[PDB]
């Protein structure tokens, strides 16, 4: 039931074997011959055309890679509930400054 020399020697020999296989393969000048849900994603899009129209586009994504990246943003944006917020902050700063100026007028 070795817990000491057996493990150490086994690791050492596997190390020498891999080192020696890599050296040989790499220095070879031999020529080498040239050789979960199963569910797709479909999106419906509603847009307005020039003049007056309301066409709807149904687009199906069968690439599971595109799927993963697409959904992950929605799930994030669904939990994410901004230029508008920055504008609101600017309005807040303006109001605060006006209030401070009113305070200065009251003091003087």
């Amino acid at each position: 039931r070795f817990s000491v020399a057996e493990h150490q020697e086994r690791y050492k020999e596997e190390c020498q074997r891999i080192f020696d296989l890599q050296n040989k393969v790499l220095s070879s000048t031999e020529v080498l011959s040239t050789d979960a849900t199963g569910r797709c994603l479909k999106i419906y899009r509603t847009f307005r055309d020039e003049e007056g129209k309301e066409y709807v586009r149904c687009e199906t994504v069968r690439k599971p890679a595109v799927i993963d990246a697409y959904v992950r943003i929605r799930t994030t944006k669904d939990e994410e509930f901004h230029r508008e917020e920055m504008r609101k902050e600017r309005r807040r700063i303006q109001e605060q400054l006006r209030r401070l100026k009113r305070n200065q007028e009251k003091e003087k």
Binding site: S33, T34, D35, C40, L41, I43, T60, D68, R74
Partner: protein, 144 residues
């Protein structure tokens, strides 16, 4: 300022490679007139003209990373540039599977570990279309 030099590898057909090699090792400026390189605005297509004879070229991506290493004493070597592209002369087509050395052949297919979960750009385009829209309806689907 200093701009890092951009080195790539040029692969020629073997007879044209022998003429270009003889003209390089000769060292005259006669080679300058003989060998020209025209790169097309595709970015992955060209002509290499050896002795005014046009050859069709493709700039391909190499699977490994090479590095040019210069030396003055042949004991200490200084890295000068990274090479990753080759203008072979005679997208998926612009990717080279083999490496330059003989042991590295079919490296991308066999000696490269592949880990997987363009696509990101397509997802960004889809998000932009959803934004330009009004109502979006989504369902993970089944066979249909």
């Amino acid at each position: 300022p200093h701009e890092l030099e951009s080195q790539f590898i040029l692969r020629l057909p073997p007879e044209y490679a022998s003429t270009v090699r003889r003209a390089v090792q000769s060292g005259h400026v006669n080679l300058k007139d003989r060998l020209t390189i025209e790169l097309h605005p595709d970015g992955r297509h060209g002509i290499v003209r050896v002795d005014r004879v046009p050859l069709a070229s493709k700039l391909v991506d190499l699977p490994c990373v090479m590095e040019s290493l210069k030396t003055i004493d042949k004991k200490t070597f200084y890295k000068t540039a990274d090479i990753c592209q080759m203008l072979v002369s005679t997208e998926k087509k612009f990717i080279w599977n083999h490496g330059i050395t003989l042991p590295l052949k079919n490296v991308r297919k066999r000696r490269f570990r592949k880990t997987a979960k363009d696509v990101e750009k397509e997802v960004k385009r889809l998000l932009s279309t959803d934004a330009e829209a009004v109502s979006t309806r989504w369902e993970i689907i089944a066979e249909d």
